[PDB]
Design a protein around this ligand. Structure first.
Ligand SMILES: [Cl-]
Length: 202
């Protein structure tokens, strides 16, 4: 079984176009390795192809090529993703090994390369953007207003499960550019609706 491989997709920022219209292409300043950057301007899931923050796709190669199994965010020397995406596996990026540094399986989080560094705090009422890296799609910022719900994990901010499951680990940002959490920790509300927690810790 092949190692999981990282692919830089986009900068981590708030996109003002998505604040205006609801969504936007992410308009990255640094080089991207995914296919949104190419002359085709289209991501190809099966192909693959640090001093700046970035959102990454997480891919694994099989006999038919790569599949994107998730996403994560590199920030201040640490790569952050969901526990269910990697399950503790080593990641590879351009020949570099990256082993896990910390996890909280209960919160569905794992960091690689140092401790957890996502500093954003969401509070009630506040709009955020999911910087969604869906399999097969170019990076997109999507404006949303999370809900505070009562869930099986407590009373938390949640977003609707409105993206591919292979978007899990994509960063969710506030207007300051801070990462309030990651997409894709599935929780169950009191009534029984499945939603994503904004996945972060305290
Ligand atoms: Cl942050």
């Amino acid at each position: 079984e092949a190692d999981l491989e990282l692919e830089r997709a986009a900068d981590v920022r708030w996109e003002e176009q998505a604040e205006i219209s609801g969504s936007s292409p992410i308009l990255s300043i640094t080089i991207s390795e995914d296919g949104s950057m190419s002359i085709k301007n289209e991501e190809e899931e099966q192909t693959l192809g640090e001093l700046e923050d970035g959102a990454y796709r997480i891919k694994q190669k099989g006999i038919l090529g790569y599949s994107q199994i998730g996403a994560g965010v590199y920030k201040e020397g640490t790569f952050h993703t969901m526990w269910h995406v990697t399950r503790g596996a080593v990641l590879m990026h351009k020949g570099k090994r990256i082993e896990p540094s910390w996890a909280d399986v209960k919160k569905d989080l794992i960091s690689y390369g140092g401790g957890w560094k996502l500093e954003g705090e969401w509070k009630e009422g506040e709009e955020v953007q999911v910087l969604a890296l869906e399999p097969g799609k170019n990076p997109r910022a999507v404006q949303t207003k999370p809900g505070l719900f009562k869930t099986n994990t407590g009373t938390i901010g949640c977003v609707s499960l409105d993206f591919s499951p292979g978007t899990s680990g994509s960063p969710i940002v506030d207007k300051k550019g801070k990462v309030v959490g990651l997409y894709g920790n599935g929780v169950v509300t009191r009534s029984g609706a499945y939603v994503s927690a904004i996945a972060n810790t305290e």
